[PDB]
Ligand SMILES: CCCCCC/C=C\CCCCCCCCCC(=O)O
């Protein structure tokens with residue numbers, strides 16, 4: 001059900017990422033580097049375990065999870081959160097909860113591109129990833 005998301009993806013457009021980071025309390029110097037970083041995201045499955053790697057020249061992350069089962073996560077910006085990833089309307093929806101706060105990381109395939117929408121507070125960031133062969 002998650003198969004068209006699988007593979008290696010490269011960032012090719014970003015809108016409002018500074019707003020999103022600032023909403024999360026990320027400091028100005030980190031935002032500055034992040035605004036010039038183009039991550040590679042690798043999504044793989046093994047049975048119903050997904051592994052999502054995010055690689056860059058600044059920070060790397062990796063998470064593994066089963067759809068629909070909560071997992072602990074420590075984010076790129078060092079938030080310790082309770083997470084769950086599900087499919088919803090064909091979109092991969094990742095919800096993070098901590099300190100009563102929430103943020104969603106929603107991935108959808110549109111015309112073969114992977115569109116990542118990040119929402120926290122009022123901030124809405126849209127990042128476009130393109131498949132690598
Ligand atoms: C590992 C690389 C994280 C993105 C590169 C910037 C690095 C650090 C700044 C704090 C980011 C925090 C929220 C990341 C949201 C996902 C971005 C995406 O997957 O596009």
Ligand SMILES: N[C@@H]1[C@@H](O)[C@H](O)[C@@H](COP(=O)(O)O)O[C@@H]1O
Nearest residue numbers: 058059060061073074075076078
């Ligand atoms: N296990 C932690 C992660 O939970 C946290 O996300 C990361 C910060 O990012 P980076 O590894 O790029 O410093 O540090 C470790 O790897």
